[PDB]
Structures are given as structure tokens and as C-alpha cells.
Amino acid sequence: KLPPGWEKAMSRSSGRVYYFNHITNASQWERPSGEPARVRCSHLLVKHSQSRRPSSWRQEKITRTKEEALELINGYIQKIKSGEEDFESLASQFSDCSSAKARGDLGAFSRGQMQKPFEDASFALRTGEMSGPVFTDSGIHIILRTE
Numbered sequence: 001k002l003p004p005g006w007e008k009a010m011s012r013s014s015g016r017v018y019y020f021n022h023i024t025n026a027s028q029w030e031r032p033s034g035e036p037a038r039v040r041c042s043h044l045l046v047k048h049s050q051s052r053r054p055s056s057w058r059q060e061k062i063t064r065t066k067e068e069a070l071e072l073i074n075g076y077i078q079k080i081k082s083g084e085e086d087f088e089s090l091a092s093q094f095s096d097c098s099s100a101k102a103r104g105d106l107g108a109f110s111r112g113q114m115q116k117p118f119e120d121a122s123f124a125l126r127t128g129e130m131s132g133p134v135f136t137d138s139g140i141h142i143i144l145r146t147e
């Protein structure tokens, strides 16, 4: 009925239908319409104390909980979607990845090279589309597919 990984859902506050992708954790009101060898993505990573390496250029010892990191991620998603902030601006300032200095850009990549939840979300995103929170051993990501 719908593109890969989409399902209908119902808003608990408005009762209106919306669409949720269980691979990207994206959600949207409008019905989704609709794979390449390679995709190009940017990301904003928020690490937590159970990240594989709980350190980054922002903090020598990263101590925030997983729950706290998800709250930060959710707040960045809100500001990106409202247009108060740009994805790139937030990634440059607050991503716990070395790619922050490149506005979050990771370049292009194939299947097999990235951690699996990140890879699957990246390839299920359409060009220009942004993920919801994506969980990996590194932490929690917001992913933007650019190509």
C-alpha cells in the first residue's frame, strides 16, 4: 500500500491519522508516495554513558544518560522541523561526532560500511528527508539524506 516501512497511526491528541516509518523513525502527516548503490548523509550524534566510546570533541568524559540524550535529540528535531534552527547549524554545534566540523556530513557510502541501524535508516530515507531518532552503539543519531 505504501513505500517500504510505513504504517498508518493515529494521533493521541488530535485523533488525526499520520504516517510512521519504523526503519527511520520518521513521522509525518501527509501520505508517503512511492535502491541505489550509494547514499550520502549527514548526521547529528548525541552520545551517552553507554556509547561505545563515551567521549567526543565536546566532552572528555560523557556522562549523560541514554534518556537524557534522547531528550536532547528530540529537542533538536523539534527545532529543525519548526525551522528555528538548521540541521547543519545544530550538527556543527552539538554533534558528538568528529563530522560536526563538516556540518555533519559523512560523505557517500555503500551498504556494509556503517552500523546497521544507521545504514538501514539512511537507505530508507528519501533524498532531502530526515530521520527520527536512530539508535546505534555510538549513541542516538538524527540523519539527513543529502544524495
Ligand SMILES: Cc1noc(C)c1CO
Residues within 6 Å of the ligand: 086, 087, 088, 089, 090, 092, 103
Ligand atoms: C547554517 C550553518 N550550519 O553550520 C554552520 C557552521 C552554519 C553557519 O552558521
